[PDB]
Amino acid sequence: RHKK
Amino acid sequence: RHKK
Amino acid sequence: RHKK
Amino acid sequence: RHKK
Amino acid sequence: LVPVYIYSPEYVSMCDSLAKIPKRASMVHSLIEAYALHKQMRIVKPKVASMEEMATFHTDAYLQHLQKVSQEGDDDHPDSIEYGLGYDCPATEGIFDYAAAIGGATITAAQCLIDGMCKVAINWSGGWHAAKKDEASGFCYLNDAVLGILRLRRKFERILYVDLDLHHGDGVEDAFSFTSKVMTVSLHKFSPGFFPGTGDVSDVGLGKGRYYSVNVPIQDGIQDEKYYQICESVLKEVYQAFNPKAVVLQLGADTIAGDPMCSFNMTPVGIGKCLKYILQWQLATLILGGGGYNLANTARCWTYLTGVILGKTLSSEIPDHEFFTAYGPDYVLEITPSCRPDRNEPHRIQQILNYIKGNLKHVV
Amino acid sequence: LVPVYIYSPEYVSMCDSLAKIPKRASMVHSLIEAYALHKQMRIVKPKVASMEEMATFHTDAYLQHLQKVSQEGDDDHPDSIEYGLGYDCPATEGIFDYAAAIGGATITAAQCLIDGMCKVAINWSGGWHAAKKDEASGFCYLNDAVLGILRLRRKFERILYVDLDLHHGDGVEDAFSFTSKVMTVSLHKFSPGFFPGTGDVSDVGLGKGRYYSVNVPIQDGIQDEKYYQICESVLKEVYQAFNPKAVVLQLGADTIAGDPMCSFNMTPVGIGKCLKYILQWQLATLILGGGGYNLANTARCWTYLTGVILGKTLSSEIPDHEFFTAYGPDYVLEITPSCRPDRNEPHRIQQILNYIKGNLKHVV
Amino acid sequence: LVPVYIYSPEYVSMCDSLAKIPKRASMVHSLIEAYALHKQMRIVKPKVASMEEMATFHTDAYLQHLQKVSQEGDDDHPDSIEYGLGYDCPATEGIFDYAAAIGGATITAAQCLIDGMCKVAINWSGGWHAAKKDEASGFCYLNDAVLGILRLRRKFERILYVDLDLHHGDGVEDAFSFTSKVMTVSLHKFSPGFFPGTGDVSDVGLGKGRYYSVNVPIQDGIQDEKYYQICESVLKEVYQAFNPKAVVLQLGADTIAGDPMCSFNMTPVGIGKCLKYILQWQLATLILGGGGYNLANTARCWTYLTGVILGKTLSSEIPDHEFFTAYGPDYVLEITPSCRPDRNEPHRIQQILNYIKGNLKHVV
Amino acid sequence: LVPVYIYSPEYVSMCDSLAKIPKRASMVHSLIEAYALHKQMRIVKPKVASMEEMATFHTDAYLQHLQKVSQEGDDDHPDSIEYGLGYDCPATEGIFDYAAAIGGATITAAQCLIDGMCKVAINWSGGWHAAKKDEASGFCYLNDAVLGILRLRRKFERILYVDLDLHHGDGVEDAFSFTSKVMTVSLHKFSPGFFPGTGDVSDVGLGKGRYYSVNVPIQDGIQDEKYYQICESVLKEVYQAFNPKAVVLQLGADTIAGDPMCSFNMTPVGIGKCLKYILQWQLATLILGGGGYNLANTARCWTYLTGVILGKTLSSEIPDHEFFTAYGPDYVLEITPSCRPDRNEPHRIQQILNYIKGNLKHVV
Ligand SMILES: *Nc1ccc2c(C)cc(=O)oc2c1
Ligand SMILES: *Nc1ccc2c(C)cc(=O)oc2c1
Ligand SMILES: *Nc1ccc2c(C)cc(=O)oc2c1
Ligand SMILES: *Nc1ccc2c(C)cc(=O)oc2c1
Ligand SMILES: [K+]
Ligand SMILES: [K+]
Ligand SMILES: [K+]
Ligand SMILES: [K+]
Ligand SMILES: [K+]
Ligand SMILES: [K+]
Ligand SMILES: [K+]
Ligand SMILES: [K+]
Ligand SMILES: [Zn+2]
Ligand SMILES: [Zn+2]
Ligand SMILES: [Zn+2]
Numbered sequence A, B, C, D: 001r002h003k004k
Numbered sequence E, F, G, H: 001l002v003p004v005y006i007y008s009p010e011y012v013s014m015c016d017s018l019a020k021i022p023k024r025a026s027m028v029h030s031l032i033e034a035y036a037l038h039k040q041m042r043i044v045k046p047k048v049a050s051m052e053e054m055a056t057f058h059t060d061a062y063l064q065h066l067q068k069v070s071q072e073g074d075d076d077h078p079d080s081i082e083y084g085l086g087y088d089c090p091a092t093e094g095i096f097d098y099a100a101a102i103g104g105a106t107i108t109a110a111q112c113l114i115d116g117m118c119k120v121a122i123n124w125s126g127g128w129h130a131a132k133k134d135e136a137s138g139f140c141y142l143n144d145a146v147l148g149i150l151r152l153r154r155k156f157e158r159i160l161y162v163d164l165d166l167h168h169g170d171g172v173e174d175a176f177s178f179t180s181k182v183m184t185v186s187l188h189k190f191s192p193g194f195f196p197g198t199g200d201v202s203d204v205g206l207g208k209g210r211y212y213s214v215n216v217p218i219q220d221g222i223q224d225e226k227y228y229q230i231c232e233s234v235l236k237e238v239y240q241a242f243n244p245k246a247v248v249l250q251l252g253a254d255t256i257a258g259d260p261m262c263s264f265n266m267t268p269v270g271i272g273k274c275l276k277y278i279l280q281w282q283l284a285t286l287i288l289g290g291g292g293y294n295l296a297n298t299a300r301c302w303t304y305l306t307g308v309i310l311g312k313t314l315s316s317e318i319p320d321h322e323f324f325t326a327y328g329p330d331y332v333l334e335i336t337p338s339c340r341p342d343r344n345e346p347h348r349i350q351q352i353l354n355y356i357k358g359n360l361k362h363v364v
């Protein structure tokens, strides 16, 4: 999952 | 027979 | 949502 | 000045 | 003048117990009540059908068996398979009582029509059109539709049975295939592999009943407009040639978009127009339910249709009630067609309507 | 190098209890045994999954709820709706135990593959691909497929999950949408209104898992030849780009002609060719069942496929056994396609195969 | 007739406490007040959301957890990771109270629209579009936008949600992906590796909600003119097809040049034209803030936009105020685009606008 | 000959407290320890820098201020803005102590190199290259890199500072822009709007330091191969012309794919090759960390690089440890590049490499  |  |  |  | 509504807390409770449609009866009544439509109808408690009444169509052997396995829900009886019990029709305990309750309910409805107590009698929990005299079939254990028709025969000369369920009303057509006193008209999906497999436009009845059975085979994806055109065209011809004195109408909601069977693409409004066309005949009309496997949508549809029967226009917002959370996320009464193709080629529909119009010329 | 067959009289007995497919487990095993195929496999009794094992994917909240309503079959719990229980997934009593039994069964199968006890492990009662971590869905209460894949991850670097069920394997694809270590490939019917509504060719996974999810949307009426072409074309590309070390194959028989869902028009032979293509990879393979609503046909299909796994050719005549009467009208093993249209336009299939081939170029 | 401005010293004080944007709420209000714009609006103190109101979207499990770790700021809880707490969403103490305050603030705004108290309600501290029902995400702990939309649903049939934040409004789109009563339109940066990773033009919603989700993927360097063209083109089509009765507009200023995320190259003026186009619809409009990591610029932008809402033209010189020292060393309101490339190829934008126009033809 | 690893439970604990990178220090050390690499290095507890040591670069005014606001975390002091404190560098309480701890740690590392205790000293928690003598900047409160270089100057004539962080190492370049005894080489993203905004290929130092500053401006999307080519080409020329006696290497992992800044598209392997090229010089080398906003990836990268320093090849599987779940769902050490464009046009890179080669001809 991508981090913001 | 057929299944419904 | 759809029913199966 | 910039924001990192 | 006022419509009869067959209802009873005990009745609904029994119907909620049917294997393939748990709680559906309650949801239907609940939404109807939530719209306060029951206040505009004459509520009549249904009577349970007697062994004699059921035996007017069903054989004693089958009835005896049903009642036997119904005792404790024997789903391992060696003779059940010959009697149609099994996957589609499991021998759930008490099933005989439920079947007798539904049969009685439709019989009560017909009796009300006969007694002139009303012009329209409703039994949303009825419509099990697939049952044969000696065999359970397609979720149907007893053919209440047939029992109702037989009852109406005591007073009316010609009965018109119209089946708008997604499936062919084979049980009913069967029961009266040799009769010219009862005409069966069925609109349904007809495609190799699709239950029950019968009901081609060429099936018109046997012997003295030849031409007194009408079948309209339809393909997937049909919508309101084209469907009503077909229905009106066929009903106009049938009415003119058969001149019925009473009508039994089955309205299985498994044709409505959103149904897990995902075949037809109808909305309650389309079915409503068909209903209106039949009601404008001003004949004794026995309204039945049937299929409908999207519970909330089935309740939405029959509630809307009840409104049509009552000449009322219902609020778009689903009123709060016991099953409110079931109508999420939109919580509205209207149903939207799915974005898929209508596989019905116009020339074929034309072809079918004509073959039927031809068959009906022989009805005098 | 002899196939492991997950079986247990108690296990089959529990699977026979699932709402939507009563007795199916017994019929499947029964027909397999009637062909004496179990004698050519290593029978392994399945272990029940522990709360910890199930918790490797499913949340405690959901698991606790399932176990709670499973106690006495509370189908009126106010929180069930949020957990997916309802029409498709009723809270039948003991359901938690059955779900745990199926999950354990698939886990046992994976463990056998890991221990080098075999190259092919079979659990025909598994394949409940629609369950989410915190929600029951599509007749699935626990996602055994996911549990099995997780177990295989202990020894294999890359797992290829292939779902040939009629429905999109959304639960499994979901579980691993962010993973690049597990690739999911699903062939299924994709049409507005058809469950679950996901699985378009454009769905390729998320984040680091982008392009590690493959979906092949197909229309009604597809038959053996065209289907295998699609499957082979996609699997050839996937194998080459992903180079799996183990494979989990779901083979829901609801794609077979005769199924009441009447969508695809396949025969066990077509699915068999797909199976053969995957088996020729010589990888550890976990075979699972799934959908299949024509019980006799489902048994016919998996029995035939078991024979394919064993490299045997079965007798066309259905041997006498407990359910022989269910194999009418011809009492043979072969299944014949229904006489209806293949709605799949060649240019669209081509279009889809290319988008996929393009997506796969990004897998390295 | 006059715009409602959700404000409260205690509210701003709580917002100033959010980890990723310290003091931003004060700077925004301070600059707005320094321009005396609050005197031209109806100031309404926000109410804190109740556990019941928040529970209309968020699960109790998640809410309970948030409230628990919020007690003393437990950032070591073993279950936090499953609930999305962590790097992007640290469990700072009191966070539950802030989230409830923001949620309540947007709910209060919607209620004002419902009560006809105004046509435009503002909550610059809201717009946390990434939160899921059971998971914190992208600096968002509670999805106030969703809560607001749900509240507006009490009075309006169709709600149009427009997200102009730099990031895809995935939380909101998610909440309503199966709904056709709420349409979500999001313009955002879409590029592998860029949070959240979703929102491709092919994402259009699921089930009954298919085609009721619109996504416009955009590349780095876009400026005012091209951006407005895209926004207007899409909003024109959406309005015509969906005919909204109310609008919730998220205006994250992280698209403005000077933002440390350095992706888009917009100025408050460009966003203003989009705002004007939505306001000319004359519908109940709920204005929300969102991202914006160049604090002074975010205050500059929302202050300017507040002026647009009020139809006033603000003085170019930044008036002296509490955070006057933060706008050094120039002290003007206007923002200048950075001297970098617009990576958006015209043919791709065209391609996207058309795919969308096609998707919208299905909305009826 | 064995590498020195600057570590201390108290030190790591303090670093974990930095606003922009909570817990990162622990994750880094934890993963290094989980791979048992610390057992192959000489662990040295760092000493805290004295006010005097810090004052060798930072002004007393700034130091006094830092220490003052650090007391109780006064983030409202009127003079903080002039000293760079604010959004990027909040005045979190105890910050002075953390800064002093980091500065001391890098100084301790340099002292170890001076004492011949090793050839390579590591301080993964250092690398705060943006701090100015009298101003905090870019998450940097004290420039430990500069302090380390100054310390090394006590024994080495020429120090080569190489900054591979995503951002321009402006603070360090600044400190020595007038010196010819310290050469600074920085590879970083250079694009209008991107912090800090300096570091164009034309920036080469001032006065006597002219040509002793090297800057390599790079665009988004660069990957391992092209990046190493650039780095090697530049380092080859620099080494030859400057002939350093010691090297300080900053390895900010914010260049690694997966970083929320989503600019460069590097993997730890590419940075590893650069590291290897510098290590083959056999000079005293002080290794520092820096940026890295994808915590798990930063730990992955520096752990891998530590292995490169130790000449070991690490297991692909992330060993179980305190932060194991943070490496899901693949749980591997390798990092995959994102599927996005390399915006670096070959002719421009060529152009830049030459301009630099030309500048270096003046270094004698
Ligand atoms: N997603 C995201 C990106 C960048 C961040 C920085 C620079 C600091 C922080 O505290 O959190 C961030 C989160
Ligand atoms: N005829 C028929 C078709 C489908 C069925 C499902 C999915 C479940 C069930 O219990 O019975 C069915 C019967
Ligand atoms: N999704 C689905 C479709 C059809 C069904 C039938 C005919 C019966 C049932 O019990 O559940 C069903 C579920
Ligand atoms: N320079 C910079 C960029 C981004 C940031 C985020 C997303 C959060 C934060 O706290 O500080 C940041 C600083
Ligand atoms: K029909
Ligand atoms: K007849
Ligand atoms: K499938
Ligand atoms: K995947
Ligand atoms: K957006
Ligand atoms: K929607
Ligand atoms: K750098
Ligand atoms: K220099
Ligand atoms: Zn039906
Ligand atoms: Zn459409
Ligand atoms: Zn299926």
Ligand SMILES: [Zn+2]
Binding pocket: G165, G166, G167, G252, G254, G290, G291, G292
């Ligand atoms: Zn944003």
Ligand SMILES: [Zn+2]
Binding pocket: H165, H166, H167, H252, H254, H290, H291, H292
């Ligand atoms: Zn950096």
Ligand SMILES: [Zn+2]
Binding pocket: F361, F362, H338, H339, H340
């Ligand atoms: Zn790629």
